[PDB]
Design a protein around this ligand. Structure first.
Ligand SMILES: O=S(=O)(O)OC[C@H]1O[C@@](COS(=O)(=O)O)(O[C@H]2O[C@H](COS(=O)(=O)O)[C@@H](OS(=O)(=O)O)[C@H](OS(=O)(=O)O)[C@H]2OS(=O)(=O)O)[C@@H](OS(=O)(=O)O)[C@@H]1OS(=O)(=O)O
Ligand SMILES: O=S(=O)(O)OC[C@H]1O[C@@](COS(=O)(=O)O)(O[C@H]2O[C@H](COS(=O)(=O)O)[C@@H](OS(=O)(=O)O)[C@H](OS(=O)(=O)O)[C@H]2OS(=O)(=O)O)[C@@H](OS(=O)(=O)O)[C@@H]1OS(=O)(=O)O
Lengths: 131, 100, 100, 128
């Protein structure tokens, strides 16, 4: 289709995932925001890396479930992307996959931490939207 | 105790952009209260939304204040506004549907 | 634009009686709005409810306007009031907790 | 032994009105929410309003109603859930999991719309 600068929209509270320059990750509903354009990439597939095109910062998750942005791509940066039933997409930490840690967003915009996420919630369902 | 309408659930309604894959189903809500109990109707892009404007029509559940359209296709894209009224006033809210 | 507090989710709050089996967990909510954003505190049977009034204390989650008590025992039976305020006014709501 | 069935969905007490309709109310003072349950168990019950003698029953369409005579549409499988709430399942329509339930607004749910996982099918019997 169109392998480019998507906006990750989460169906939980209608936010676009956002990687701010201080390294924090969160959602916002402002389409004008400079920190929501994201490039995704394999190989493969779906093992993706999600990067802010604006800062070059990569989405990553810690060993305690917290999402943050890193300047260096790396092991905590891979995600298992599966097209759901759905047809939404979900992303699971590659490093913490045997535990089901999904990237997710609360209806208030802030992130869920991996341990509090699971299959069946609205928070872990994304749809990549054109910019 | 005569009162104009008021929303009873502002938290649900702050999710304005509803982006949905077709052929999924979508539900909009605007729970309200008022005395007498208000009525509600939906607009699509600012004008009367009748059954006749979509193949399969749509359901309105008055008991839940909601509007439901199943098998969402591209022509559903648009703004949907719920207008809630009694004889003392009305309140409205708009949602944006976007079908991927 | 100065504005006293108002409930943002009356629909949730209508369930006043929360009847729960011990050793379960209970959550009470009073989502609110207001400018400046108001504060909240909880009363148990009309008085300050501090951490030291129940084994294990309890959690308040301001980000959600909620009060959470784990492992509910009979000493928790009572009325819990959420009081929400700013400098223009306060609103309150009370839940009755009953432990089976 | 005469309990009030409390529903955790919206916090209603199950209520069997004299016109035979069943719903929920939060009025503690209401004359139609005192219910007597009974066996021959193991876990299989009859639910009767003590003030009107009518029995809680579910019809072939999933709708709850009260009958004057006890009968096959009145048996319910009572299950202490790992919660510990109780659940009731139509005995006739058990192979389809038709639970007795209540919407957050007080109205009943119909069997077909209930499913294991909803708050609507969770009940606690409270003392009167
Ligand atoms: O439970 S889950 O982690 O699976 O998330 C959804 C259900 O969680 C509650 C209750 O708390 S919990 O079960 O111990 O997690 O919602 C509360 O937390 C969820 C997740 O928050 S968490 O703190 O990150 O784990 C939040 O909802 S959401 O993020 O999925 O959207 C609520 O906050 S928010 O409105 O999203 O911003 C939060 O509220 S509170 O602590 O009770 O005050 C359940 O309660 S709910 O908020 O009334 O829905 C959620 O669903 S359930 O139907 O009760 O199973
Ligand atoms: O099924 S749940 O365990 O998730 O409990 C309530 C959720 O059901 C929805 C939609 O799915 S459905 O239950 O299978 O139809 O709510 C809508 O229907 C339920 C049940 O009503 S029905 O008469 O059996 O169809 C209503 O909730 S309840 O009656 O079980 O309490 C909702 O009404 S209300 O919120 O109680 O006012 C009803 O609303 S609507 O059709 O969407 O207009 C979910 O949607 S919700 O209303 O937006 O909350 C409910 O929660 S979920 O977290 O999305 O699963």
């Amino acid at each position: 289709n169109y392998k480019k600068p998507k906006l990750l929209y989460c169906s939980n509270g209608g936010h676009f995932l956002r990687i701010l320059p201080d390294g924090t990750v969160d959602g916002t509903r402002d389409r004008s925001d400079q920190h929501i354009q994201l490039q995704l990439s394999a190989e493969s597939v779906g093992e993706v890396y999600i990067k802010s095109t604006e800062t070059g910062q990569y989405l990553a998750m810690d060993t305690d479930g917290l999402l943050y942005g890193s300047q260096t791509p790396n092991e905590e940066c891979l995600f298992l992307e599966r097209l759901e039933e759905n047809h939404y997409n979900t992303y699971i930490s590659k490093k913490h996959a045997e535990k089901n840690w999904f990237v997710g967003l609360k209806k208030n915009g802030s992130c869920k931490r991996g341990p509090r996420t699971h299959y069946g919630q609205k928070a872990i369902l994304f749809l990549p939207l054109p910019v | 105790n005569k009162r104009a309408p008021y929303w009873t659930n502002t938290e649900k309604m702050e999710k304005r952009l509803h982006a949905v894959p077709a052929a999924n189903t979508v539900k909009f809500r605007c729970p309200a209260g008022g005395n007498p109990m208000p009525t509600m109707r939906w607009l699509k892009n600012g004008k009367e939304f009748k059954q006749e404007h979509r193949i399969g029509g749509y359901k309105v559940r008055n008991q839940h204040w909601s509007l439901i359209m199943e098998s969402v296709v591209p022509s559903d894209k648009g703004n949907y506004t719920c207008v809630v009224e009694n004889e003392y006033g009305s309140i409205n809210h708009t949602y944006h549907l976007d079908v991927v």
